[PDB]
């Protein structure tokens, strides 16, 4: 028994966003988590909403797929969303998780730097879409810089970016 979600959804500010789940036989409830914050429910049934949650979130289930739509995404609610379905054997089955991010600054190309040693190291910096892949090992989760950008490092190279590749 598996529940499948898209890994990432990226939208512009002022644009709606959609998250779909699959493989659900009963009612699905959605949780929103934040880095360093406790989870909270935003849609506690297929369509219902709890008190205190604004009306930007709306969900609907059709067959075996339950979708959650955010109307007018902002700099707020840049977060990870999970789903939950009750099952008979395992009491609660959770989804893989969908990351919702917004583009409040335009795209920038990363800068790579490789250093010969026997440890080979590549340093990547200054890129706003954080989803980057490195090929040639240990790689980092791309964390935020001081100037609202991202950096990463590799240890042992080519890097793949959205519409680009840089090999050194």
């Amino acid at each position: 028994y598996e529940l499948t979600q898209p890994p990432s959804v990226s939208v512009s500010p002022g644009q709606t966003a959609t998250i779909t789940c699959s493989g659900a036989s009963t009612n699905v409830c959605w949780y929103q988590v934040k880095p360093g914050q406790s989870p909270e429910v935003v849609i506690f049934e297929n369509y219902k909403r709890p008190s205190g949650i604004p009306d930007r979130f709306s969900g609907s289930k059709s067959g075996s797929t339950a979708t959650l739509t955010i109307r007018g995404t902002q700099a707020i609610d840049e977060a990870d969303y999970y789903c939950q379905v009750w099952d008979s054997f395992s009491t609660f089955v959770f989804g893989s998780g969908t990351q919702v991010t917004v583009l409040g600054q335009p795209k920038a190309n990363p800068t790579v730097t490789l250093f010969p040693p026997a440890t080979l190291v590549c340093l990547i910096s200054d890129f706003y879409p954080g989803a980057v892949t490195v090929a040639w090992v240990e790689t980092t989760t791309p964390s935020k810089q001081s100037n609202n950008k991202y950096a990463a490092s590799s240890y042992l190279c080519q890097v793949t970016h959205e519409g680009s590749t840089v090999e050194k």
Binding site: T26, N27, E45, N46, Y47, K61, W86, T91
Partner: protein
């Protein structure tokens, strides 16, 4: 006219009086009467005062050395005190797997021995429910409704007063209403709000479905005597084979009983909806399983073959429900109060009438072409709300002023 005190209750008249109030239409509400909230308090009060002269099983929270359907029964040996305060004995008993927990193998304790010591039920008082009538005090009145199509809420135009209510048996049960009053004309669906799926649904039958049980283990009870005048009735050896307890529902009646239920449920949800049934979705043992008391022993039956059907709008086989037996009972969900049930010698048989259901609807859509109904339970106030639904208590205000063409000299 036992644990249910017939001493404190005054004797009623041999024949009651029922005046048919003509031209009277009174508004009833079964979901907000204060005759079930007083009844629940009285059930608790007359329950917990019959376990006051009974023995308190505080010396029995010891270390149990336990060895081995399969795995349900455990043979536990343990130290115990004696009438003489200087000597000790080594005794053994047969406990269930639902009553013991591992200390951290062959190292067990009772499940309640962090919370409280259970009070053993006295082996002479009976657990059989007896009918009790709730009479009104002086200056008050009880207005029975006599309509045969009443759905609990709203105006009843056939209001008649009564001295006292009919015989209401305090039968505790879950997912089924055993030994209850039957409807007169059709199967009745009663809910506080049909559209809201957080409200329980009470289904009342017009014909009963018979259920018969077995506890096929020939149990032997032995009295391990703790101290001066105090005894602990344990489980001895079981004579013969060991088989699980079960109780049966006839297939040919439960089919088309569910048909009547679906036919009366399509009047609120639409003519074309596909009515489905599922077994359970609870987490507690009392909520998941049909919990009742057969003969003195508390059964938890797995009603999964009963609620397994789908219904789309267009002769001796029986359904066997396996049941589990528990001895440490926390009945009214009070924190820190349990009760140990002594074993009963021989074979125990049910015979009971299924006279209702407590269903719960799974929502999800505003426009749904299918509906799923699962058995509920939990609170015991819905068991007695299926009997005190036609009754209403009122006070009399006999003082009026009126204009008349006459004056005092």
């Amino acid at each position: 006219d036992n644990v249910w005190a017939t001493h404190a209750c005054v004797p009623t008249d041999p024949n009651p009086q029922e005046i048919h109030l003509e031209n009277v239409t009174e508004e009833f509400n079964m979901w907000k009467n204060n005759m079930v909230e007083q009844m629940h308090t009285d059930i608790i009060s007359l329950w917990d005062q019959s376990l006051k002269p009974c023995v308190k099983l505080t010396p029995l929270c010891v270390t149990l050395q336990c060895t081995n359907m399969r795995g349900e029964l455990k043979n536990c040996s343990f130290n115990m005190t004696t009438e003489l305060r200087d000597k000790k004995q080594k005794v053994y008993s047969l406990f269930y797997r639902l009553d013991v927990v591992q200390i951290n193998n062959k190292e067990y304790r009772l499940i309640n021995c962090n919370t409280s010591a259970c009070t053993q039920a006295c082996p002479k008082v009976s657990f059989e429910p007896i009918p009790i009538h709730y009479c009104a005090p002086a200056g008050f009145a009880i207005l029975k409704c006599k309509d045969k199509k009443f759905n609990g809420t709203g105006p009843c135009p056939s209001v008649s007063t009564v001295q006292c209510t009919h015989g209401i048996k305090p039968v505790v049960s879950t997912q089924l209403l055993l030994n209850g009053s039957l409807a007169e004309e059709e199967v009745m669906i009663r809910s506080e709000n049909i559209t809201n799926n957080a409200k329980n649904i009470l289904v009342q039958f017009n014909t009963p479905v018979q259920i018969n049980c077995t506890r096929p283990n020939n149990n032997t009870r032995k009295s391990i005597r703790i101290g001066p005048g105090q005894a602990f009735y344990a489980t001895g050896d079981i004579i013969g084979d060991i088989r699980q307890a079960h109780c049966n529902v006839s297939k040919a009646t439960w089919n088309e009983t569910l048909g009547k239920v679906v036919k009366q449920l399509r009047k609120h949800f639409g003519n074309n909806t596909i009515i489905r049934f599922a077994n359970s979705s609870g987490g507690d043992l009392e909520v998941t399983t049909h919990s009742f008391n057969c003969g003195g022993e508390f059964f938890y039956c797995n009603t999964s073959g009963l609620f397994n059907s789908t219904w789309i709008s267009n002769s001796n086989d029986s359904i066997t429900l396996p049941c589990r037996i528990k001895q440490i009972i926390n009945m009214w969900q009070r924190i820190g109060q349990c009760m140990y049930a002594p074993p009963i010698q021989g074979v125990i048989r049910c015979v009971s009438n299924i006279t209702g259901l407590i269903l719960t609807r799974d929502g999800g859509s505003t426009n749904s072409t299918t509906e799923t109904f699962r058995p509920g339970g939990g609170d015991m106030r819905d068991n007695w709300r299926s009997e005190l639904y036609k009754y209403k208590v009122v006070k009399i205000e006999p003082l009026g002023v009126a204009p008349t063409r006459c004056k005092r000299r």
